[PDB]
Coordinates of C-alpha atoms and ligand atoms in Angstrom, one line a residue:
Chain A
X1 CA 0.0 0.0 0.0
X2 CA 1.0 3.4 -1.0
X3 CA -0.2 6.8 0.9
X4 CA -3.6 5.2 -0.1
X5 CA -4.7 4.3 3.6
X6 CA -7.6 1.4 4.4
X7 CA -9.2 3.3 7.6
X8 CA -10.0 7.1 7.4
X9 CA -12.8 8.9 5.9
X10 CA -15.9 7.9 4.5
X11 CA -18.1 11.4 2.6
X12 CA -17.8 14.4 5.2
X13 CA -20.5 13.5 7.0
X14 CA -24.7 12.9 6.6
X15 CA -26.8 14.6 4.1
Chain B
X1 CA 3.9 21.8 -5.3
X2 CA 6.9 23.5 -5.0
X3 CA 7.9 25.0 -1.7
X4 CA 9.2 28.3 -2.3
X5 CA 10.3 29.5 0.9
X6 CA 11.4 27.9 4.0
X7 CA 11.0 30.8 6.9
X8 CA 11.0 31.3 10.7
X9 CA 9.6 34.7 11.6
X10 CA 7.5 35.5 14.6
X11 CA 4.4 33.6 15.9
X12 CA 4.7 29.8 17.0
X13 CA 1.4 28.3 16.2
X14 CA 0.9 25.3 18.4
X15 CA -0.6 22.3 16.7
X16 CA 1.4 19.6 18.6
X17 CA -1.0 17.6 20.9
X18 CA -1.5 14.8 22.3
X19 CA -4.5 12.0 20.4
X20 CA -8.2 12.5 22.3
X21 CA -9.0 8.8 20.9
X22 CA -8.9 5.9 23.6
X23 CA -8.4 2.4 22.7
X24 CA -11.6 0.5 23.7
X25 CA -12.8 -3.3 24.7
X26 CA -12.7 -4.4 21.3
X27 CA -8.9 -3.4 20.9
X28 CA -7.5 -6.5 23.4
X29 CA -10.0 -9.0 21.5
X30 CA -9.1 -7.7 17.7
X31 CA -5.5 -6.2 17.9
X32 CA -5.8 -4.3 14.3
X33 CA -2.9 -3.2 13.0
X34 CA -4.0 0.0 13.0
X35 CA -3.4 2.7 15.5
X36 CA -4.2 6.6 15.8
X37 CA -2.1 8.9 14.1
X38 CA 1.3 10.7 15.4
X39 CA 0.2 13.9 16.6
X40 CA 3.7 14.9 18.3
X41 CA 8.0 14.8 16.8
X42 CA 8.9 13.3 20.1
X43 CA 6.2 10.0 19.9
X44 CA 7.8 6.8 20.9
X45 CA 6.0 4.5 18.6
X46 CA 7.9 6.3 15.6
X47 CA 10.4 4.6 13.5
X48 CA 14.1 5.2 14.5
X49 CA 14.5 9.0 14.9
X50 CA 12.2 10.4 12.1
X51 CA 11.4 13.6 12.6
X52 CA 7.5 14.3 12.2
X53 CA 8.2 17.7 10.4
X54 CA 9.9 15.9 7.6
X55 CA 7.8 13.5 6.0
X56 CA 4.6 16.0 6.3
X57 CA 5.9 18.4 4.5
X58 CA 7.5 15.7 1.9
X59 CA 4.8 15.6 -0.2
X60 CA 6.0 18.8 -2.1
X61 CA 7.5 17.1 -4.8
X62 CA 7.7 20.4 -6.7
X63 CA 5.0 22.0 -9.0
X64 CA 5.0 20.3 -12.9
X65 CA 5.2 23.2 -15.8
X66 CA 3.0 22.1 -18.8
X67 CA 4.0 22.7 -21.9
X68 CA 1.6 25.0 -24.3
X69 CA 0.1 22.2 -26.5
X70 CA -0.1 20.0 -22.6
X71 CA -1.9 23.2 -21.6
X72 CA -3.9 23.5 -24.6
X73 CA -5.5 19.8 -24.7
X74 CA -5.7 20.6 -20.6
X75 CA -8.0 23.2 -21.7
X76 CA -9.8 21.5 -24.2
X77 CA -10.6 18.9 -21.8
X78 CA -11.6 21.5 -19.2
X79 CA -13.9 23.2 -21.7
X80 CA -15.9 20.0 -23.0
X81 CA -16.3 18.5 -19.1
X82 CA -17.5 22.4 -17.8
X83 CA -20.0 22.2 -20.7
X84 CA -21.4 18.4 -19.3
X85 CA -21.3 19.5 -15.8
X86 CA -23.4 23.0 -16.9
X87 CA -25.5 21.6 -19.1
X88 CA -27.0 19.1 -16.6
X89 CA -26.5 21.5 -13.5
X90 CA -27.5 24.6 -15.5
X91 CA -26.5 28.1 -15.2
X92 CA -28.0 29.0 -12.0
X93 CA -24.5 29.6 -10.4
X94 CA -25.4 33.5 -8.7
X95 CA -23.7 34.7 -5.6
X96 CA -25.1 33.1 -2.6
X97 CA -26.3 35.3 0.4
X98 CA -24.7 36.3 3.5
X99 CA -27.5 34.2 4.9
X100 CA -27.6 31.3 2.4
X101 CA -23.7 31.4 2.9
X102 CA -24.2 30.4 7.2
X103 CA -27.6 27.9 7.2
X104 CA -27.0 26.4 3.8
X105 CA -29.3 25.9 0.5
X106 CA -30.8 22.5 -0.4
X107 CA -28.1 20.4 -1.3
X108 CA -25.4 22.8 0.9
X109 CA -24.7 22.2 4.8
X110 CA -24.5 24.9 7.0
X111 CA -21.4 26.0 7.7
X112 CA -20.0 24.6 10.9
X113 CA -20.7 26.7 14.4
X114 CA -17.3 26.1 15.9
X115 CA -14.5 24.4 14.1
X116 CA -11.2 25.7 14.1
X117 CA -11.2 29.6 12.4
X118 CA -8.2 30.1 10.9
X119 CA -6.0 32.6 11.0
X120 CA -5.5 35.6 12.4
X121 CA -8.0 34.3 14.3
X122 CA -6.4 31.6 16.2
X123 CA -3.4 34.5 17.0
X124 CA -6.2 36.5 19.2
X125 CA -7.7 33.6 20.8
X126 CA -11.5 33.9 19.6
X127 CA -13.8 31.2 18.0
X128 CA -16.1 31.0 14.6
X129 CA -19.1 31.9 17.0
X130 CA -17.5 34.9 18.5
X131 CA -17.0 36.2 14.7
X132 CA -20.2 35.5 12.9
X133 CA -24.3 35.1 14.0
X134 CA -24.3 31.2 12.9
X135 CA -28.0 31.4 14.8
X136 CA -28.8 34.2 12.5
X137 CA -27.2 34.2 9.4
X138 CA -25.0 37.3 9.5
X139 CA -21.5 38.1 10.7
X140 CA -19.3 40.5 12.7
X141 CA -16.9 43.4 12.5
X142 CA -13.8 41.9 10.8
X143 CA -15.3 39.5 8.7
X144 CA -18.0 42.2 7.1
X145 CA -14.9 43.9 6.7
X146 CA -12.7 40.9 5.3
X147 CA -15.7 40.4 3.1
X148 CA -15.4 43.6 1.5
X149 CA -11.3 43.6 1.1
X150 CA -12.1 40.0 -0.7
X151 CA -14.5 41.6 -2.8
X152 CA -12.4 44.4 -3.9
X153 CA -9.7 41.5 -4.9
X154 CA -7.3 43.2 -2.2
X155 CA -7.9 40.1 0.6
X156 CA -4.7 38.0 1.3
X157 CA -4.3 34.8 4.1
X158 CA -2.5 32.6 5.6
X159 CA -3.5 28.6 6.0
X160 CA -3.3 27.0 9.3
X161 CA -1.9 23.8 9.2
X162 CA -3.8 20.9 11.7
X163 CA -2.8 17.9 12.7
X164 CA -5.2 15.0 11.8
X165 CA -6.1 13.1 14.9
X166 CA -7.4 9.6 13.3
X167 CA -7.0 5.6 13.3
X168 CA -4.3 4.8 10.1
X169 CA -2.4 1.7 9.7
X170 CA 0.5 1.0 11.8
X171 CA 2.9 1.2 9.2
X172 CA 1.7 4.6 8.4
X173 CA 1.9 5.3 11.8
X174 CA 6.0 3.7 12.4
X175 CA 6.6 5.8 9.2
X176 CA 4.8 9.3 10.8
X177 CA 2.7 9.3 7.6
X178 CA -0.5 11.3 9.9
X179 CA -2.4 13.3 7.4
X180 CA -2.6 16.8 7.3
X181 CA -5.6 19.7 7.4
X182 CA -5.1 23.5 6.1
X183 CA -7.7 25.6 8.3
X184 CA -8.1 28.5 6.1
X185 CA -9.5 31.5 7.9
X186 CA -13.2 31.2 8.3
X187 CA -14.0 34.4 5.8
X188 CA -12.3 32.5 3.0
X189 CA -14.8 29.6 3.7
X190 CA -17.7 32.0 4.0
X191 CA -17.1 33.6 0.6
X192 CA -16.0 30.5 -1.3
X193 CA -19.5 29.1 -1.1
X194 CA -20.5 32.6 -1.8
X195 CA -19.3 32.1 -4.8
X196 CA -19.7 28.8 -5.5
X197 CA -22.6 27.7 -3.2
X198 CA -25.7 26.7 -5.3
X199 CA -22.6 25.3 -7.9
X200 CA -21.7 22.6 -5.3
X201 CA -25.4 22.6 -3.5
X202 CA -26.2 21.6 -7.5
X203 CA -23.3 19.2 -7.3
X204 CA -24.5 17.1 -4.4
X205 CA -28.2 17.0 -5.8
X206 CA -26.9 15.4 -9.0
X207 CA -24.0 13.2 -7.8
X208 CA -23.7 10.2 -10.0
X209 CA -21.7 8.4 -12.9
X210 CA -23.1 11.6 -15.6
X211 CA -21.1 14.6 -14.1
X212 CA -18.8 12.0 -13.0
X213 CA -19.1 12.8 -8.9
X214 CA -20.2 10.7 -6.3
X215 CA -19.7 14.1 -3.5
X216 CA -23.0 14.3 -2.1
X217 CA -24.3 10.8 -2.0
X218 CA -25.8 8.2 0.3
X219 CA -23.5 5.1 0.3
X220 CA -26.1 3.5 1.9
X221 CA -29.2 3.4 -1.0
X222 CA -26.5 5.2 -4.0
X223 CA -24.8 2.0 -3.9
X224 CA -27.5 0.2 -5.9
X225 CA -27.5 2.9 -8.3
X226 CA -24.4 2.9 -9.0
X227 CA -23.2 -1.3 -8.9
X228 CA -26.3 -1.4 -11.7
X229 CA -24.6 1.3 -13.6
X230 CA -20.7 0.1 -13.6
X231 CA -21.7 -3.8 -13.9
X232 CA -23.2 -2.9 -17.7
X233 CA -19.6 -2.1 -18.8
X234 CA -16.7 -4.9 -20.4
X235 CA -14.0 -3.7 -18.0
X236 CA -14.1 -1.3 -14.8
X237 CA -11.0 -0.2 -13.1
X238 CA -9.8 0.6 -9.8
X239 CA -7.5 3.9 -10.1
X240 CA -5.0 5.0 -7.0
X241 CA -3.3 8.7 -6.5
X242 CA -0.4 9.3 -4.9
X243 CA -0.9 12.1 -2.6
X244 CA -3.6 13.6 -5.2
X245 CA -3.9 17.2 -3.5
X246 CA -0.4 18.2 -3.5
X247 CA 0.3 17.2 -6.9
X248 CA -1.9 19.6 -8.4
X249 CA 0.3 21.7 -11.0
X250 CA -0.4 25.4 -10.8
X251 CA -1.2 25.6 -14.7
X252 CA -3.9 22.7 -14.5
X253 CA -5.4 24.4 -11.3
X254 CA -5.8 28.1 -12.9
X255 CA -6.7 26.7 -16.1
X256 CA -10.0 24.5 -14.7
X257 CA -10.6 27.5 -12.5
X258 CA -10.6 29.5 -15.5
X259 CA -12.7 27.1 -17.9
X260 CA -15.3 25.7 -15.1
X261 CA -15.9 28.8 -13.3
X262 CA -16.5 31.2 -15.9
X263 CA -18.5 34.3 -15.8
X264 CA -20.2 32.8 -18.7
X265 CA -22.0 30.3 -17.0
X266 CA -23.5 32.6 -14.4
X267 CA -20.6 32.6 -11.8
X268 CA -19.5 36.4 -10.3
X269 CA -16.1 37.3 -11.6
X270 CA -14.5 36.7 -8.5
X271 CA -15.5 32.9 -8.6
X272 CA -12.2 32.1 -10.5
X273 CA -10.8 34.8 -8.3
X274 CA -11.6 33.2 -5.3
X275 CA -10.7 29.6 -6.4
X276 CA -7.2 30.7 -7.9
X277 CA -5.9 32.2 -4.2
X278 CA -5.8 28.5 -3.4
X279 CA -3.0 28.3 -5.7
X280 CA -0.1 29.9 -3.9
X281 CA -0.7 29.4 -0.5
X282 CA 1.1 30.5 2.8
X283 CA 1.3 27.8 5.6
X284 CA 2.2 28.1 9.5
X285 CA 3.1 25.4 11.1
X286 CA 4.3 26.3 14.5
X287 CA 7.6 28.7 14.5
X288 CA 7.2 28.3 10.6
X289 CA 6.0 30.2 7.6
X290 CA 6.4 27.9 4.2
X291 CA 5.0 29.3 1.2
X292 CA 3.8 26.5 -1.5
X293 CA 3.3 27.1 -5.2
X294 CA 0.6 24.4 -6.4
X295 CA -1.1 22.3 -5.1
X296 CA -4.5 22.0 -2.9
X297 CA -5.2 22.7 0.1
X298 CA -6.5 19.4 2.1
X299 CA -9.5 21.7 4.0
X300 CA -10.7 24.0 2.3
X301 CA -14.4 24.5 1.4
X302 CA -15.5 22.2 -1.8
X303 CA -12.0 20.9 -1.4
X304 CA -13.9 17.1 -2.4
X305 CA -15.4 18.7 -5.3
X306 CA -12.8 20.4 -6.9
X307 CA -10.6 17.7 -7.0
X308 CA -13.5 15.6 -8.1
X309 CA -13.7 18.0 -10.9
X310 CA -9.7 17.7 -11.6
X311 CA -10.1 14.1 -11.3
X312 CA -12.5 13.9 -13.9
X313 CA -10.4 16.1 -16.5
X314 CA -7.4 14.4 -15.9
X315 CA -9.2 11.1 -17.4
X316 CA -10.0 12.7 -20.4
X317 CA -6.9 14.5 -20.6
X318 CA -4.7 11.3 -20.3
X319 CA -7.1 9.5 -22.9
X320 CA -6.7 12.2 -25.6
X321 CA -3.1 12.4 -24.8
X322 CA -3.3 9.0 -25.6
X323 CA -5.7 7.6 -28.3
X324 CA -7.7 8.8 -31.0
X325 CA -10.9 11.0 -30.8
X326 CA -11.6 10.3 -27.5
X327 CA -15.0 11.7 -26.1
X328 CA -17.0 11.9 -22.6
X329 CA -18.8 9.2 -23.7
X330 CA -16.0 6.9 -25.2
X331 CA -15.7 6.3 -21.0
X332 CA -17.4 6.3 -18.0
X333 CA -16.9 7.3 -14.6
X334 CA -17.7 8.3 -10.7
X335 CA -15.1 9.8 -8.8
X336 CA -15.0 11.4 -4.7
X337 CA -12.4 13.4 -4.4
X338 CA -9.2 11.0 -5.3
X339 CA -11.6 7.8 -5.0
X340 CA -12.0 6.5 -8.6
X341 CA -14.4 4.1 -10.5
X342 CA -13.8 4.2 -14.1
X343 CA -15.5 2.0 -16.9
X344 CA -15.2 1.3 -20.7
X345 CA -16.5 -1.3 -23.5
X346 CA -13.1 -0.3 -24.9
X347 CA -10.2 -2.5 -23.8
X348 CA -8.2 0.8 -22.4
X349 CA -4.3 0.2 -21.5
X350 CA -4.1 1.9 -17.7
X351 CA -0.5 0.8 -17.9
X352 CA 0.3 3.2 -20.4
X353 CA -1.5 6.2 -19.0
X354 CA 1.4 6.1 -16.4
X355 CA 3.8 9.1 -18.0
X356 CA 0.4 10.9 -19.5
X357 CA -0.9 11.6 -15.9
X358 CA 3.0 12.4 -14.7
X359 CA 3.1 15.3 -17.5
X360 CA 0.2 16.3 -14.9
X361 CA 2.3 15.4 -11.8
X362 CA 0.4 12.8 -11.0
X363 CA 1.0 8.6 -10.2
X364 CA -1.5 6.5 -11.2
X365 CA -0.8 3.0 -9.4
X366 CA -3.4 0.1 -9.3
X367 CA -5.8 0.1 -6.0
X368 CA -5.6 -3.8 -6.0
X369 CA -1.1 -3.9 -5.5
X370 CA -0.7 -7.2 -6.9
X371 CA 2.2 -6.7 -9.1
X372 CA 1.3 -2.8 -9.8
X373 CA 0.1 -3.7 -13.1
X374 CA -3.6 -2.0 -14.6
X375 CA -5.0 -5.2 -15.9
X376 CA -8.2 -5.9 -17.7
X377 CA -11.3 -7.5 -17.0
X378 CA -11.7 -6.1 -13.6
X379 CA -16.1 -6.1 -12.3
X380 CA -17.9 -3.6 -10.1
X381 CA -17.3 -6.5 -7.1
X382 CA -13.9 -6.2 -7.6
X383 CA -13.1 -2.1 -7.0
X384 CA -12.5 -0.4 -3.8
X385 CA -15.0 2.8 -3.6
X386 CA -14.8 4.7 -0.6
X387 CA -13.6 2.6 1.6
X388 CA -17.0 0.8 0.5
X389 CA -16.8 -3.1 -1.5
X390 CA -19.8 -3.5 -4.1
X391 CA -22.0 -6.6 -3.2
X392 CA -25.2 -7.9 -4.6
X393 CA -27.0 -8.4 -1.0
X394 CA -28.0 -12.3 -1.0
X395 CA -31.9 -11.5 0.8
X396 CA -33.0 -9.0 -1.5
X397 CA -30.9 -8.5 -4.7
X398 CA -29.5 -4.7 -4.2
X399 CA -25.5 -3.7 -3.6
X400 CA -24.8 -3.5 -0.5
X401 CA -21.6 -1.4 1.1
X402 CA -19.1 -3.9 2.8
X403 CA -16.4 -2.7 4.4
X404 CA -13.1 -4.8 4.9
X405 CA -13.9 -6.7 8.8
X406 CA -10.5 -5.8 9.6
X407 CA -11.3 -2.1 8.8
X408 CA -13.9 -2.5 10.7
X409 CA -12.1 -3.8 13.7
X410 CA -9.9 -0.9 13.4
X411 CA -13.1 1.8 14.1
X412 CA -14.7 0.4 16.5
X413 CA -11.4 -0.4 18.8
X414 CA -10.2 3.4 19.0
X415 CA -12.9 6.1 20.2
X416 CA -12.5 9.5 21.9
X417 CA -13.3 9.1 25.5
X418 CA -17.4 8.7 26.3
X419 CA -18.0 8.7 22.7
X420 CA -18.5 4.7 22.8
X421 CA -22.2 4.4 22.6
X422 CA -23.2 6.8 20.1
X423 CA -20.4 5.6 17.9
X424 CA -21.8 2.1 18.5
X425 CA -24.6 2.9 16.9
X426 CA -23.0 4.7 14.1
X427 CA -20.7 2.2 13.1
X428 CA -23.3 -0.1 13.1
X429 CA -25.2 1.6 10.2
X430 CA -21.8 0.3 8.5
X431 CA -21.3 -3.0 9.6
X432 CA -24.7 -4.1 9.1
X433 CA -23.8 -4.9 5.5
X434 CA -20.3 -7.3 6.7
X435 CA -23.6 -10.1 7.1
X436 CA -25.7 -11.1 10.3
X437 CA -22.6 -13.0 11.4
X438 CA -19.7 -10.8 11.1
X439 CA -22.2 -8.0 13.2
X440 CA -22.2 -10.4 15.8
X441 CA -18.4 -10.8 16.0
X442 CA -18.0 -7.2 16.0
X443 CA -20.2 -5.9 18.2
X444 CA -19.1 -9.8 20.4
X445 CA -16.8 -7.0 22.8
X446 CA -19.9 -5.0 23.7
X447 CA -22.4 -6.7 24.9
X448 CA -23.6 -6.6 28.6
X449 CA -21.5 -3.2 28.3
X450 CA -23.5 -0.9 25.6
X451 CA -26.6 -0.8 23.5
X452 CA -26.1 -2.8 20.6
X453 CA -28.7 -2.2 17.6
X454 CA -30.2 -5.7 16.7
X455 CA -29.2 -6.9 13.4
X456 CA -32.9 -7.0 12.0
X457 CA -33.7 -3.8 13.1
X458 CA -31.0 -2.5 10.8
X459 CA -31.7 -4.8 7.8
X460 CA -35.3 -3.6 7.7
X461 CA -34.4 -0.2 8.2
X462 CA -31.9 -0.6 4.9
X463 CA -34.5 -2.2 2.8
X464 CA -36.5 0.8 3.6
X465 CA -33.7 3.2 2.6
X466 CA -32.8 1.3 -0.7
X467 CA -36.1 1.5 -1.8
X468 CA -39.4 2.4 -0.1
X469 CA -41.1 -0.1 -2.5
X470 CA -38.7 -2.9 -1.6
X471 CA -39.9 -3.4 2.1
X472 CA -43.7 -2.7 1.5
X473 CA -43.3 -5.4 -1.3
X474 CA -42.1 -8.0 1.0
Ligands
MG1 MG1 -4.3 15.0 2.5
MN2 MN1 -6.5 8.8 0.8

């Protein structure tokens, strides 16, 4: 894996 | 970009801290290999004396010049996606109000009521609140006045750097990888969805695979629209960016800025204006002052959807540096931010798009590593979309959002302190989808301790969400 990371950000946050 | 200037003037802005996130129950059960970010030079779970300061900044691999026929096709590329995006959006792009600018238009969120305000904000000790009405809709002394200076083109700023306190992989971690933010001050933020506000209130409204955006959309029931969408295509592809915000070159960010946000299509002439400041940026970081020539800032308002909209022209720019009378429609795709799904009928050599993005500054690598090589054939249930696996959902036939269980693992064993519970139920709006199994293991930690959603009572609520039809018809 590059800088590309598995667990961070999903969106922003809700609609 | 290119760092300019390397300077140590004045004012020490303190971003060292220590992380506010605990490690909970399900930590000593799952051990991930994941752990929360290094928010201080002196942490002892770095890798042998590596300063912190170092590898943040590192990313600045310098800013690439484009050559005027690179710059020309750029453009060309710019023009013809600006004049899909419009022409679906329309031209309804006017200056949002002072008001509409705080609460937020259908589409837009309100602007948040006390975040981090930039600078010189932070230098005086004051918060968003104690600058502008966020419970009315208007501001306050300086920033009625900053508004004016930014409207007279004189305004100039400086970008607070933050430290981003959040789980990443250990290896990240060792290496002192932990992502940055750039606070800009808070008047930049107001006026930049001033400008752009009912552009990316328009944006959200209409996310999907035709203006090529996926900012603004409900993983949760979107999923189904687009899995159907990507599975009609021969071969889909799973595109990866290396450090996609600081690799924008100055001359494709002021010439997208100049072809998307044109006064043409009803935007105010300091739209582009407005956008173009985010080119040469100023950055504190404690005792220092580093100017940065190209380049995003990772903070900024619409910071998702510009690079969405960068994203999308560099596919078309890299194509048409490539092959022959290539058009919008020879390809397909859906992109948030640096998150890419692209699809073709077309049998399109990735592998060889490699020096055509790097005349952009950018490295395209495979998302799947196995031996770095863009290889053909690739389905929908093969790509990685925010974070997010596409699965046909065996019970009622939709696509369902799995994340990794090991991902998973790595949420729900690292929360803030008395956060537990209400992050319990949100994770569990994720997790649902892992299968009524792999909740159980999960959530196994939890139980007798917290509240823990039954699976059925978040399966039917899904079903409901998907499609209103789909759980009155069963
Ligand atoms: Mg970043
Ligand atoms: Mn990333």
């Amino acid at each position: 894996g590059p800088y590309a990371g598995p667990l961070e950000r999903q969106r922003p946050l809700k609609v | 970009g290119l760092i300019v200037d390397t300077r140590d003037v004045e004012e020490r802005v303190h971003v060292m801290r220590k992380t506010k996130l605990a490690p909970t129950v399900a930590h000593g059960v799952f051990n991930p290999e994941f752990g929360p970010a290094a928010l201080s030079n002196k942490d002892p779970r770095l890798n042998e004396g590596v300063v912190l300061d170092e590898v943040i900044f590192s990313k600045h691999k310098g800013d690439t010049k484009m050559s005027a026929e690179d710059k020309a096709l750029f453009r060309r590329c710019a023009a013809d996606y600006a004049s899909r995006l419009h022409s679906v959006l329309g031209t309804a792009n006017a200056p949002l109000s002072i008001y509409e600018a705080i609460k937020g238009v259908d589409g837009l969120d309100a602007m948040e009521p006390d975040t981090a305000p930039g600078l010189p904000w932070a230098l005086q000790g004051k918060r968003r609140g104690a600058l502008i009405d966020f419970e009315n809709g208007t501001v306050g002394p300086e920033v009625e006045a900053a508004l004016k200076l930014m409207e007279k083109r004189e305004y100039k700023f400086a970008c607070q750097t933050f430290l981003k306190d959040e789980i990443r992989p250990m290896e990240k971690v060792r290496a002192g990888k932990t992502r940055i933010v750039d606070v800009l001050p808070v008047e930049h933020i107001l006026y930049t969805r001033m400008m752009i506000g009912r552009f990316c209130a328009q944006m959200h409204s209409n996310n999907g695979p035709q203006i090529g955006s996926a900012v603004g959309c409900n993983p949760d029931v979107d999923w189904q629209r687009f899995g159907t969408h990507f599975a009609q295509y021969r071969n889909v592809w799973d595109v990866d960016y290396s450090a996609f915000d600081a690799n924008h070159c100055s001359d494709a960010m002021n010439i997208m800025f100049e072809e998307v946000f044109r006064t043409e299509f009803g935007f105010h002439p300091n739209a582009e204006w407005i956008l173009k400041t985010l080119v040469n940026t100023e950055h504190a970081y404690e005792n220092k002052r580093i100017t940065v020539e190209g380049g995003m800032p990772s903070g900024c308002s619409a910071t998702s959807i510009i690079n969405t909209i960068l994203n999308n022209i560099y596919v078309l720019y890299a194509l048409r540096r490539h092959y022959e009378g290539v058009e919008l429609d020879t390809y397909t795709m859906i992109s948030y931010g640096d998150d890419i799904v692209v699809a073709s009928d077309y049998d399109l050599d990735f592998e060889a798009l490699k020096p055509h993005f790097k005349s952009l500054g950018q490295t395209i690598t495979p998302a799947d590593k196995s031996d770095k090589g863009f290889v053909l054939g690739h389905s929908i249930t093969d790509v990685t979309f925010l974070k997010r696996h596409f699965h046909m959902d065996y019970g009622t036939g939709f696509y369902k959002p799995v994340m990794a269980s090991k991902t998973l693992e790595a949420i729900l064993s690292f929360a803030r302190r008395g956060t537990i519970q209400e992050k319990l139920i949100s994770v569990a709006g994720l997790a649902v989808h892992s299968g009524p199994d792999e909740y159980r293991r999960l959530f196994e930690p939890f139980q007798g301790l917290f509240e823990i959603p039954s699976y059925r009572s978040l399966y039917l609520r899904w079903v409901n969400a998907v499609c209103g039809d789909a759980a009155a018809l069963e």
